[PDB]
RNA sequence: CCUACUUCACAAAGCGCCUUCUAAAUGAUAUCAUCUCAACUUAAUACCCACACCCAAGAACAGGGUU
């Protein structure tokens, strides 16, 4: 409070940069967080005319994880206008030719279907690896929490965790395994 | 009774314990006392108040204006004690009722600025091929109130 | 267990056989799952149980050995499949796209080239119907088809 | 003067010097200006929150599009708080 | 961010909430550091908007835009 | 694309010529076995990109040359 008029308005309506981890996550929950942030729907000031969207930097987007057999079963379709130019490719082939396009198409779907969708999509920046350019790493503010609880393997178990887990049964003394 | 540490054993939501009401009502008593001292010592700046006037709730502060869509049955310039205050807060504390605050605790007082009518509004009905076209012009009466003062009493 | 050590002399030697844990909180069951109050309280996440109930090369032990009931033996079977394909078992090898909750083997699923209309849409199966009877800590139930 | 802020009525230039002179009058040490919160530093639409501190604790903070403007307007905010002519003050009693 | 103090009053008719402002600690702060198509492309990339916003409009739209709009506050 | 032939002649053509790159073991559930909606292992390049006069460029505009 007690700001001058122009800096108070500038403080209210400024847009923020949010980093979003994308390893072991589904593209849909990342798209939910991203599109909520891009429309400005995470702001109490929100209005669709005010254009109060934010910047979202989803990194590690080549290590996303479809839940289920979707990697062989979800198909992305397009049609170049020329006769016979219908291209259907699974999520695997699209993830190999371009390891950005899955989360981009998910976010493009979740965004509202108006003329602001392209500007909102141009606010968002996708990177496939841990590497982010320096001119974007100087703008981030909050690292959004990953929506999916990452599971951990046998390797990441400590000794105390498997010792605290009670082992349940009698193996027969004579069994070959 | 015992289930070992397993993914669906414990709830995903974090465990929280509510304090038993003895030290909680001690905490409530000291908080109410200390807020009462802030009220009686003038530790507030200007106050805002959610006030249920005619049929709708207004976030009313001092020195400001409200438009009301009906005759209020008052000549211009008389003051008003708006009952049904239902939230009153300051820079550091709020007081919200169940569902109202008592009339001994909040005084919100307003003046009647003006008694106009609305702009002429259009009510036009039209069903196609049925020759159905009706037009009505309405002007709803309105009064504008100047909220003057929102003061508070140290009765808690 | 026992091991077949060969070198030519070949012998079978019994080594390091475990037993029950000192106390089951609910004894007089028929299966360890029913005996440790895990009848509807595991998932594909927890590879502790799923690590117990498998061979060192990713296969399972038969029900005549582990003493499981049929229902949760099939449940542990499906959870072994779901945990192996999700990459949660990296030390149980015979000798890249990230997944989880994969019901079917990823090598033999045909893509849905023509999903149907809104009333006959071919859905994508997620999770398994054996784990349908789990404890429901969610307000809305599991969607097994996406 | 209802609705009008202080420096939309009493126009000043260089509030930082007036502020350090005022805290010299109050025998408080000269403020340290620290960049509390920032977003979009390298882009064409930045935001900086600059906080004026006095002996380990802040007297005020204020936003701006660049660090100089943010420091200047945080100085104006601290002058408002010191002079007591805040946006939160008691209204005039009529 | 979460630290406020709630208290039901004695007779239990009003809810008194107390909420001072959290001031940013000094230790949580940094010190202050001390053609026509290509034009649309450069402005679009610098402001993260599409190109379509930057092309001008005809005279009909330039005339309906209100020149002295009503100003509040 | 015009060196020849042919219609033919500052050139356009063809009948003429040139160029065109799902399967194996291993294996549990069900200790044998078993291809496994079990786990694994293995078996697009190119192309394109800085007045006026004549033109192999062209409806106009454009484009190339004007040493």
From Swiss-Prot, chain A:
Asked if the Swiss-Prot or TrEMBL record annotates the protein with the keyword Ribosomal protein, the reply is yes
What molecular function terms (GO) are annotated for this protein? mRNA binding; RNA binding; structural constituent of ribosome
| GO cellular component labels | mitochondrial inner membrane; mitochondrial large ribosomal subunit; mitochondrial ribosome; mitochondrion; ribosome
Q: Which Gene3D superfamilies match?
A: Ribosomal protein L13 (3.90.1180.10)
Annotated compartments = Mitochondrion
Which Pfam families does the UniProt entry name for this protein?
Ribosomal_L13
Cite the entry's keywords alphabetically: Acetylation, Mitochondrion, Ribonucleoprotein, Ribosomal protein
What biological-process GO terms show up in the record?
Answer: mitochondrial translation; negative regulation of translation; translation
Top-rank taxon? Eukaryota
Q: Which residues carry this modification: N-acetylserine?
A: 1
Q: Which residues cross the membrane?
A: none
Q: How does it assemble?
A: Component of the mitochondrial large ribosomal subunit (mt-LSU). Mature mammalian 55S mitochondrial ribosomes consist of a small (28S) and a large (39S) subunit. The 28S small subunit contains a 12S ribosomal RNA (12S mt-rRNA) and 30 different proteins. The 39S large subunit contains a 16S rRNA (16S mt-rRNA), a copy of mitochondrial valine transfer RNA (mt-tRNA(Val)), which plays an integral structural role, and 52 different proteins. Interacts with OXA1L.
Q: Which family does it belong to?
A: Belongs to the universal ribosomal protein uL13 family.
Q: What NCBIfam families does the entry give?
A: rplM_bact
What is the designated name of this protein? Large ribosomal subunit protein uL13m
Name of encoding gene: MRPL13
UniProtKB/Swiss-Prot annotation, chain B:
Its main localization is mitochondrion
Q: Which GO terms describe its cellular component?
A: mitochondrial inner membrane; mitochondrial large ribosomal subunit; mitochondrion
Offer one example of a GO biological process linked to this entry.
Answer: mitochondrial translation
Where is this protein localized, as stated in its record?
Mitochondrion
Alphabetical keyword list:
Mitochondrion, Ribonucleoprotein, Ribosomal protein, Transit peptide
First-to-last residue of the parent protein present: 49 to 204 of 205
Q: Which family does it belong to?
A: Belongs to the bacterial ribosomal protein bL21 family.
Q: Which GO MF terms are attached to this record?
A: RNA binding; structural constituent of ribosome
Subunit details for this protein?
A: Component of the mitochondrial large ribosomal subunit (mt-LSU). Mature mammalian 55S mitochondrial ribosomes consist of a small (28S) and a large (39S) subunit. The 28S small subunit contains a 12S ribosomal RNA (12S mt-rRNA) and 30 different proteins. The 39S large subunit contains a 16S rRNA (16S mt-rRNA), a copy of mitochondrial valine transfer RNA (mt-tRNA(Val)), which plays an integral structural role, and 52 different proteins.
Gene that specifies this protein: MRPL21
Can you say what this protein is called? Large ribosomal subunit protein bL21m
Could you tell me which species this protein originates from?
A: Homo sapiens
Q: Which domain of life is it from?
A: Eukaryota
Swiss-Prot record, chain C:
- Where it mainly occurs, coarsely classed, is mitochondrion
Provide a Gene Ontology MF annotation, just one.
Answer: structural constituent of ribosome
Keywords for the protein's UniProt record, in alphabetical order: Mitochondrion, Ribonucleoprotein, Ribosomal protein, Transit peptide
Q: Which GO terms describe its cellular component?
A: mitochondrial inner membrane; mitochondrial large ribosomal subunit; mitochondrial small ribosomal subunit; mitochondrion
Q: State the disulfide connectivity.
A: none
Q: How does it assemble?
A: Component of the mitochondrial large ribosomal subunit (mt-LSU). Mature mammalian 55S mitochondrial ribosomes consist of a small (28S) and a large (39S) subunit. The 28S small subunit contains a 12S ribosomal RNA (12S mt-rRNA) and 30 different proteins. The 39S large subunit contains a 16S rRNA (16S mt-rRNA), a copy of mitochondrial valine transfer RNA (mt-tRNA(Val)), which plays an integral structural role, and 52 different proteins. mL66 forms a zinc-binding site with uL10m.
Query: Which protein family is it in?
Result: Belongs to the bacterial ribosomal protein bS18 family. Mitochondrion-specific ribosomal protein mL66 subfamily.
This one is known as Large ribosomal subunit protein mL66
Q: Which organism is it from?
A: Homo sapiens (Human)
The top of its lineage is:
Eukaryota, Metazoa, Chordata, Craniata, Vertebrata
Q: Please give the range of the full-length protein represented by this chain.
A: 35 to 196 of 196
UniProtKB/Swiss-Prot annotation, chain D:
* Origin superkingdom: Eukaryota
Report the record's disulfide bonds.
none
Q: Where in the cell is it found?
A: Mitochondrion
Q: Where is the signal peptide?
A: none
Start and end residues of each DRBM domain = 14-84
Binding partners and assembly? Component of the mitochondrial large ribosomal subunit (mt-LSU). Mature mammalian 55S mitochondrial ribosomes consist of a small (28S) and a large (39S) subunit. The 28S small subunit contains a 12S ribosomal RNA (12S mt-rRNA) and 30 different proteins. The 39S large subunit contains a 16S rRNA (16S mt-rRNA), a copy of mitochondrial valine transfer RNA (mt-tRNA(Val)), which plays an integral structural role, and 52 different proteins.
**UniProt similarity note:** Belongs to the ribonuclease III family. Mitochondrion-specific ribosomal protein mL44 subfamily.
Q: Which disease is it linked to?
A: Combined oxidative phosphorylation deficiency 16: An autosomal recessive, mitochondrial disorder characterized by hypertrophic cardiomyopathy, liver steatosis, and decreased levels of mitochondrial complexes I and IV in heart and skeletal muscle.
Protein name stated in the entry = Large ribosomal subunit protein mL44
The part of the entire sequence present here spans 223 to 316 of 332
């Amino acid at each position: 409070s007690s700001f001058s008029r122009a800096p108070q308005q500038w403080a209210t309506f400024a847009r923020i940069w949010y980093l979003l981890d994308g390893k072991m996550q589904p593209p849909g929950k990342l798209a939910a967080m991203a599109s909520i942030r891009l429309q400005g729907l995470h702001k109490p000031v929100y209005h669709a005319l005010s254009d109060c969207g934010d910047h979202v930097v989803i990194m590690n987007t080549r290590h996303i994880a479809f839940s289920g057999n979707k990697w062989e079963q979800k198909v992305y379709s397009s049609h170049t206008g020329y006769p016979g130019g219908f291209r259907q490719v699974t999520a695997a082939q699209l993830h190999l030719r371009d390891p950005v396009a899955i989360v981009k198409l998910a976010i493009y779907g979740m965004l509202p279907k108006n003329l602001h969708r392209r500007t909102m999509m141009e606010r968002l920046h996708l990177f496939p690896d841990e590497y982010i350019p320096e001119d974007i790493l100087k703008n981030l503010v909050e690292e959004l929490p990953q929506p999916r609880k990452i599971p951990k393997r046998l390797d990441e178990y400590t000794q105390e965790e498997i010792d605290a887990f009670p082992r349940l049964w009698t193996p027969p003394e004579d069994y070959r395994l | 009774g015992y289930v070992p540490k397993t993914s669906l054993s414990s709830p995903p939501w974090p465990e929280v314990v509510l304090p038993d009401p003895v030290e909680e009502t001690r905490h409530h008593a000291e908080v109410v006392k200390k807020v009462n001292e802030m009220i009686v010592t003038g530790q507030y700046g200007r106050l805002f108040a959610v006030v249920h006037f005619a049929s709708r709730q207004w976030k009313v502060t001092s020195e400001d204006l409200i438009l009301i869509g009906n005759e209020l049955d008052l000549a211009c310039g008389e003051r008003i004690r708006l009952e049904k205050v239902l939230l009153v807060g300051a820079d550091n504390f709020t007081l919200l009722g169940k569902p109202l605050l008592g009339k001994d605790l909040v005084r919100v007082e307003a003046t009647v600025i003006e008694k106009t009518e609305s702009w002429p509004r259009i009510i036009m009905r039209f069903r196609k091929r049925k020759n159905f076209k009706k037009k009505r012009i309405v002007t709803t009466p309105q009064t504008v109130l100047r909220i003057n003062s929102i003061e508070i009493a140290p009765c808690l | 267990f026992r091991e077949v050590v060969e070198t030519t002399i070949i012998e079978g030697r019994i080594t390091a056989t475990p037993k029950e844990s000192p106390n089951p909180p609910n004894p007089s069951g028929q299966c360890p799952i029913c005996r440790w109050n895990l009848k509807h309280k595991y998932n594909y996440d927890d590879v502790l149980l799923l690590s117990q109930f498998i061979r060192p090369h990713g296969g399972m032990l038969p029900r005549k050995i582990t003493g499981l009931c049929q229902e949760e033996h099939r449940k542990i079977e499906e959870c072994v499949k779901m945990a192996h394909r999700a990459g949660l078992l990296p030390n149980h090898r015979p000798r890249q796209l990230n997944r989880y909750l994969t019901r079917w083997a990823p090598g033999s699923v045909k893509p849905i080239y023509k999903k149907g209309p809104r009333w006959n849409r071919v859905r994508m199966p997620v999770g398994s119907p054996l784990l349908r009877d789990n404890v429901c800590y969610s307000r809305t139930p599991w969607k097994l088809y996406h | 003067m209802t609705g009008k802020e202080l420096f939309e009525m009493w126009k000043i230039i260089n509030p930082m010097g007036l502020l350090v002179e005022e805290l010299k009058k109050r025998n408080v040490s000269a403020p340290e200006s620290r960049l509390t919160r920032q977003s979009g530093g390298t882009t064409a639409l930045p935001l900086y929150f600059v906080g004026l501190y006095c002996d380990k604790k802040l007297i005020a903070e204020g936003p701006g599009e660049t660090v100089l403007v943010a420091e200047e307007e945080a100085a104006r905010v601290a002058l408002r708080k010191l002079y007591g002519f805040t946006e939160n003050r008691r209204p005039w009693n009529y | 961010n979460c630290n406020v103090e709630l208290a039901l009053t004695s007779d239990g008719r009003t809810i008194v909430c107390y909420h001072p402002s959290v001031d940013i600690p000094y230790e949580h702060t940094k010190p202050i550091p001390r053609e026509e198509g290509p034009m649309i492309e450069q402005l679009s990339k610098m402001f993260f908007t599409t190109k379509h916003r930057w092309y001008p409009h005809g005279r009909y739209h330039r005339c309906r835009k209100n020149l002295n709009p009503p100003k509040d506050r």
